[PDB]
Amino acid sequence: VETFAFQAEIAQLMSLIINTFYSNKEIFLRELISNSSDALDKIRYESLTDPSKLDSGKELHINLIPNKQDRTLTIVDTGIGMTKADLINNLGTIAKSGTKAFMEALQAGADISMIGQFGVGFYSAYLVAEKVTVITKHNDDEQYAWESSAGGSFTVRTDTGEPMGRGTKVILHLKEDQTEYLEERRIKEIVKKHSQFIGYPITLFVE
Ligand SMILES: Cc1cccc(Cc2n[nH]c3cc(O)c(C(=O)N(C)Cc4ccccc4)cc23)c1
């Protein structure tokens, strides 16, 4: 298990998200679905020149899995996935420019719902989750588990769990007062309102 410090600007953004009074928390779902959709577009595009990239799975979809016992909402996709390099170094350097632009925009009168326009939409997961676990598998690498409860650090380890073939799985360990995001009617309402035009099937699992 490797422990890493977030870049200063990311730790500052994560503290703003956790501490600011903001009732419109539901925006987290649209942001994660949009990230899954981008990964699915990436695998679909690469598969045109190289069809062998779909050997780890042909089906291109998004699964929404609530679990009231574990108090978790899982977002699964069969996108391109991420390598260890994509996960750590790569998607921690790009973020700096967008993070600074977003925080400057917030001071200028913008609200938290505009987060996705700065490519840092993922961090909106901390509006509803006390801990986020990200399991990912890319064709060129092994299966990795990323995790953070904020506090300025994240961990990365080789995942010994159930193999996923290819894609990314976001496990949101929900805060005690955010269990509405485990309700079928609530999730359905959010997807219909903010993610109705996603070009991939979205399956809301029931318990
Ligand atoms: C912990 C962490 C590390 C890196 C990125 C993320 C964001 C994320 N949230 N939900 C996702 C779902 C995804 O399928 C992917 C992905 O594998 N790619 C290939 C798409 C992608 C979208 C947006 C940014 C980077 C990659 C990234 C994310 C979380």
From Swiss-Prot:
| Organism whose genome encodes this protein | Homo sapiens (Human)
Spell out the subcellular localization from the entry: Nucleus; Cytoplasm; Melanosome; Cell membrane
| Function as written in the Swiss-Prot or TrEMBL entry | Molecular chaperone that promotes the maturation, structural maintenance and proper regulation of specific target proteins involved for instance in cell cycle control and signal transduction. Undergoes a functional cycle that is linked to its ATPase activity which is essential for its chaperone activity. This cycle probably induces conformational changes in the client proteins, thereby causing their activation. Interacts dynamically with various co-chaperones that modulate its substrate recognition, ATPase cycle and chaperone function.
Q: Which gene encodes it?
A: HSP90AA1
In this chain, the stretch annotated as Interaction with NR3C1 covers: 1-207
Q: What is known of its domains?
A: The TPR repeat-binding motif mediates interaction with TPR repeat-containing proteins like the co-chaperone STUB1.
Q: Can you tell me which family this protein belongs to?
A: Belongs to the heat shock protein 90 family.
Sequence positions that bind ATP: N35, D77, K96, F122
Kindly provide the name given to this protein in its UniProt entry. Answer: Heat shock protein HSP 90-alpha
What processing steps or modifications follow its translation?
A: ISGylated.
Part of the intact protein present: 17 to 223 of 732
